[PDB]
């Protein structure tokens, strides 16, 4: 009886860690919309919101959001899916042309600068014989002067023909559920005080992820996932200064953002079935686009994040916040998309703080670009059409992406700059819970029975 | 070892239970293992990876004694150099997640012995039919 006999069991619950390609899914209301008014509405399978999960008792798996897969997959898929909604669109090959630009009709102040140029140019008509003269309004950031006369051109006339974003398709975020195929499972960590590294004591298997609205924001990640009860700072290694610190806080900070300029979309016929949507008139006042946060709740959340930052840096540490050190436009000033319109809003009023170890609203100004170079490709820019009317939107500041400066030579303080950098830090703040595992049956074990011949 | 209870008893539910108790729910993980302009290629290769993995596991079973038993016994004895531990301290103490690591090194030594014993039993059966 002390001789045991081996038995192989099929259907054994045991998994290894694996790397597979998850597939996209949308909600049934997201599956309800059609005709590619958003991206890829019929390409993904419909599913429920908050997909079904069951809890696993007495189990402990070690997680790591930093060496995690499927943030690479989501980054690659969102880049490629961004590209695939541009092949039916219109290339601005005939618009790379000499722009005769004068100032906008406005009370010009010689100290400041007009941020709009009224540019007239020859446009090819729908007939290949006749050309017309048409004007438009551009921003300073989209045109550059080529070398009396004052003729300009676009900044991307020497790198690419610039694909117009189609005004039919919208750029609003709709939640993706990343579903696993057969044989694979997805584990979610329900632990409260879990920094995304090491053993999670409370996991649950789930077939699809929860809803991930794709937001594109460099600093101050918007409409994210709130923390449970306190602010949680998350980093791969704190003492490394070239790692970003992802700060997720509990109650969100309400931000309002607006362009108060009432615009006139005007159509220009390029060729047969080719339309360019330009700016017509500025109906009314020429005002500057901006954003508001609440002064009191922003001071409150900064006190909360300093309270949580003093756990990794000692109690007697002076924590101060300064603005970004430099770079391109959309790594220093916080970018977003307020309904088909790309804002670049100055954060110098936000990160202006110092913290000792003892009804208002912040206005912060914005710039607007019409042509963009998303993900810094070699030859793919994107014109974005103007949209009608005053544009306002409300959002939730969910977290921050901070970066500590290279503190040396007896740093009594430690300072923190905002910084966007890679988009994957935006994507790692939503897939920090989940991992994907390979379920492997056919366990093998001894028991006291020989097969009867 | 099964009783009356109304909870769902779902896929990977008893992954943390002891392996004498997860053996009473093995048809659940066996069931939820197969069924679940460019993206159809990705979905399609995921589906054929799923059916290929299922066929590989069913082929590993089929060249052994059990083809559809889901619990089968065989004629190779448990070499005590493999795990050197008692019978009482596996079925009431450890899980399959923890028993997987303890014989992962001795895996693929066992599978060749399983195929060897099944081929020897097939030729013994053929000779026993042949002498009659």
């Amino acid at each position: 009886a002390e001789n045991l006999w081996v038995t192989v069991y099929y259907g054994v619950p045991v998994w290894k860690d694996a790397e597979t390609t998850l597939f996209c899914a949308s909600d049934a209301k997201a599956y309800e919309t059609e005709k590619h008014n958003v991206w890829a509405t019929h390409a993904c399978v419909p599913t429920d919101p908050n997909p079904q999960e069951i809890h696993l008792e007495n189990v402990t798996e070690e997680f790591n959001m930093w060496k995690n897969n499927m943030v690479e997959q989501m980054h690659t898929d969102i880049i490629s899916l961004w590209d695939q909604s541009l092949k039916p669109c219109v290339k601005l090959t005939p618009l790379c042309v000499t722009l005769q630009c004068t100032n906008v009709t406005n009370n010009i102040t010689d100290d400041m600068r007009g941020e709009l140029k009224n540019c007239s140019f020859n446009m090819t008509t729908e007939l290949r014989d006749k050309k017309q003269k048409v004007y438009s309004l551009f921003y300073r950031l989209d045109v550059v002067q080529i070398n009396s006369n004052k003729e300009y051109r676009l900044i991307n006339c020497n790198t690419s023909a610039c694909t117009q974003a189609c005004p039919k398709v919208s750029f609003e975020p709709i939640p993706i559920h990343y579903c696993a195929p057969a044989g694979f499972a997805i584990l979610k960590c329900k632990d409260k005080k879990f920094n995304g590294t090491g053993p999670c004591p409370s996991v649950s298997t789930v077939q699809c992820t929860h809803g991930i609205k794709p937001v594109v924001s460099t600093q101050l990640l918007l409409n994210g996932s709130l923390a449970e009860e306190e602010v949680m700072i998350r980093s791969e290694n704190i003492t490394n200064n070239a790692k970003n610190i992802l700060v997720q806080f509990n109650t969100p900070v309400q931000i309002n953002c607006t362009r108060p300029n009432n615009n006139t979309r005007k159509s220009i016929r390029i060729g047969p079935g080719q339309a360019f949507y330009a700016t017509g008139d500025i109906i009314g006042d020429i005002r500057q686009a901006h954003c508001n946060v609440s002064k009191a709740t922003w001071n409150e959340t900064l006190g909360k994040v300093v309270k949580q930052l003093r756990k990794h840096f000692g109690n007697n540490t002076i924590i101060r916040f300064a603005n970004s050190s430099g770079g391109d436009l959309e790594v220093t000033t916080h970018s977003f998309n307020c309904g088909g319109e790309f804002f670049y809003c100055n954060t110098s009023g936000l990160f202006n703080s110092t913290w000792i170890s003892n009804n208002d609203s912040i206005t912060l100004p914005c710039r607007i670009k019409q042509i963009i170079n998303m993900w810094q490709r070699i030859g793919q820019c994107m014109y974005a059409p103007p949209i009608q009317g005053v544009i306002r939107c409300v959002s939730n500041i969910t977290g921050l992406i901070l970066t500590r400066d290279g503190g040396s030579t007896n740093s009594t303080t430690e300072t923190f700059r905002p910084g966007g950098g890679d988009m994957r830090d935006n994507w790692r703040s939503e897939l920090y819970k989940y991992k994907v595992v390979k379920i492997e049956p056919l366990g093998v074990a001894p028991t006291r029975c020989k097969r009867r011949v | 070892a099964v009783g009356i209870g109304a909870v769902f008893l779902g896929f990977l539910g008893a992954a943390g239970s002891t392996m004498g108790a997860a053996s009473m729910t093995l048809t659940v993980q066996a069931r939820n293992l197969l069924s679940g302009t460019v993206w159809g290629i990705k979905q399609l290769q995921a589906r054929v990876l799923a059916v290929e993995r299922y066929l590989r596991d069913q082929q590993l079973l089929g060249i052994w004694g059990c083809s559809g038993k889901l619990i089968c016994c065989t004629n190779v004895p448990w070499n005590s150099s493999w795990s050197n531990r008692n019978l009482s301290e596996i079925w009431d103490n450890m899980t399959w997640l923890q028993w997987d690591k303890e014989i992962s090194n001795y895996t693929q030594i066992i599978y060749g012995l399983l195929e060897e014993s099944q081929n020897q039993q097939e030729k013994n059966e053929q000779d026993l039919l042949a002498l009659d």
Partner: antibody
Amino acid sequence: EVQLVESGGGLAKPGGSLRLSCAASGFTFSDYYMDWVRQAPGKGLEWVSRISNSGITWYTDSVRGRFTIFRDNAKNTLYLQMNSLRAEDTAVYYCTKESAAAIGHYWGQGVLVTVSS
Amino acid sequence: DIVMTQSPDSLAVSLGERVTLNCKSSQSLLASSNNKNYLAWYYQKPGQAPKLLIYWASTRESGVPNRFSGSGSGSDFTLTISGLQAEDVAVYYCQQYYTTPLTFGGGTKVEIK
């Protein structure tokens, strides 16, 4: 005909301990899962624990290994031991019998536990 | 976890006419394998141990007469009464028993107006 009659204690200092038992008459303990469900005074009912036919325990995520459940199949009773009591444990406790269709098929009478000094 | 939310907080009606109550779930409780759904509709009197009314999200318990109906599948569920009695006017509950932790509804206290 099947009664689940409970016993134990009701008077406990905050930060203490108590053991609550449940005898049952009407069925066999060999094949039925047991539960423990509490109700706060004026608030909703809530689940605490569940035990299998052979001793596989399931706990809610607040009792976190402070409460244990032991079902003496020989002495035909169900046991809930409470170590390191908390002030929010003042409730009425119930042992139930589970059917295969819905849990809480039959219902214990309750023990009013007041964790107060 | 799974949040079970009952849509009204109370319902004070007259006696004799029908009513209806709803319980929404934060997660679809419809088991795809069994093709059957997981609600326990309970009934607790004042000062009494509760009893089951509806199991498998549709089926009445023995001892319960024909005047109740558990209805609906998927994620949103409906307990419809056909005739109100004086024995019935106390708290109803909805319970998911699909996973651990077993969570209940808020409790709609139906009384007489």
